[PDB]
């Protein structure tokens, strides 16, 4: 349960702009193992809406290539908790951010995928230490991190 | 470089018998990401030879199924360091063991795959803490662990 790790006092408008998926972790190996694994999503940009929803631009390895993608996570009564409701009720939880270097979030349905986002293509040990604190509380069985060269490539190739 | 983490005073004959690949970690994502990834090897048994070599029985997802496999790692002047020399000179390094619950080893060519082996199908937090200490020193970018149900299945399905 990642609802145990949410950010206090979140200002969503301040997460706007460029991010890099530096590290990813998932409850089930299958969520991240292939390059076409379903939660292997490479964030490009967060765009908070004026009405306070969260647009997420990401890349996804889909049918033999690197696809540009766009979803809208809808605000809730809880500032750190957004909904992507399709066939299933899925949540986006913002765990922690300093707005200007890192952001930790999880996608949750008990199945779960989390990421360490960073503003620039470099290995932020500070950010990764905060990511590992978060995961210590959660039942993850796969963890990936990327190098600065991969971070500057489409779908982290 | 995993040569920095070798076990002092290793008695190879005492590693004989049943092991489970509880956790795996690799320098490069591609070494462990598919189920058919080349270092996704599921140890069954260590068999030290009378002359002091190390036979390793493992399973491997190969050409659409779970293959039984057998290699011989040859002893060196160094008790904790074995060679699997093919086209390339590859090393098996025993990092640490208590003989009766856990064993940490790495396969190394700078590319590297390491495992936390345990004697029985259960999540040994003690063993996994010693594994994470070892990896802290090494440049790993993917980490997997398995649940007791997967550990009792062919190729950890």
Swiss-Prot record, chains A, B:
PROSITE patterns assigned to the protein according to its UniProt record, in alphabetical order: LIPOCALIN
Official protein name in the record: Beta-lactoglobulin
UniProt entry tagged with the keyword Transcription: no
Changes after translation: Alternate disulfide bonds occur in equal amounts in all variants examined.
PANTHER family, alphabetized: GLYCODELIN, LIPOCALIN
Chief location bin: secreted
GO cellular component, one term: extracellular region
Family the UniProt entry places it in: Belongs to the calycin superfamily. Lipocalin family.
Pfam families the record matches: Lipocalin (PF00061)
Organism of derivation: Bos taurus
Keywords: Allergen, Disulfide bond, Milk protein, Retinol-binding, Secreted, Signal, Transport
Disulfides per UniProt: 66-155, 106-114, 106-116
Result when mutating residue 59 to H: In variant C; found only in the Jersey breed
Subcellular location as annotated: Secreted
Superkingdom of this protein's organism: Eukaryota
The protein's assembly and partners: Under physiological conditions beta-lactoglobulin exists as an equilibrium mixture of monomeric and dimeric forms. Interaction with LMBR1L which mediates the endocytosis of LGB has been observed in PubMed:17991420, but not in PubMed:23964685.
Tissues of expression: Synthesized in mammary gland and secreted in milk.
Function: Primary component of whey, it binds retinol and is probably involved in the transport of that molecule.
TM helices/strands, residue ranges: none
Database matches in SUPFAM superfamilies: Lipocalins
GO molecular function: identical protein binding; long-chain fatty acid binding; retinol binding
